[PDB]
Homo-oligomer: 57 residues x 2
């Protein structure tokens, strides 16, 4: 779980990507048999953020 | 995809929920071999909303 490596600015960048993705309709939002909702997405951070994470990871 | 069936309020409650779960460390946030970010969460809506959604399904 990369979250515990995220910069504060990196953490905001994710939230917005997740929001935007959720709002534009990317990813998969599923309502399960038992009524529980799941959301799943893939997105990109800018290259220079990724590399910094690829490094500490 | 359930997003087609949400009310705009339910759409909102979903977003708040995803945003809380991400901030509080719920779900799984990963970094891929290719540097992509992925995030996946499961969460509840209030019973009455859920019940409505299951009815229209």
């Amino acid at each position: 779980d990369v979250r515990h490596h995220f910069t504060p600015s990196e953490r905001q960048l994710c939230l917005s990507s997740i929001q935007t993705a959720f709002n534009q309709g990317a990813g998969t939002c599923t309502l399960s048999d038992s009524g529980r909702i799941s959301y799943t997405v893939e997105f990109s951070l800018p290259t220079h953020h990724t590399v910094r994470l690829i490094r500490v990871t």
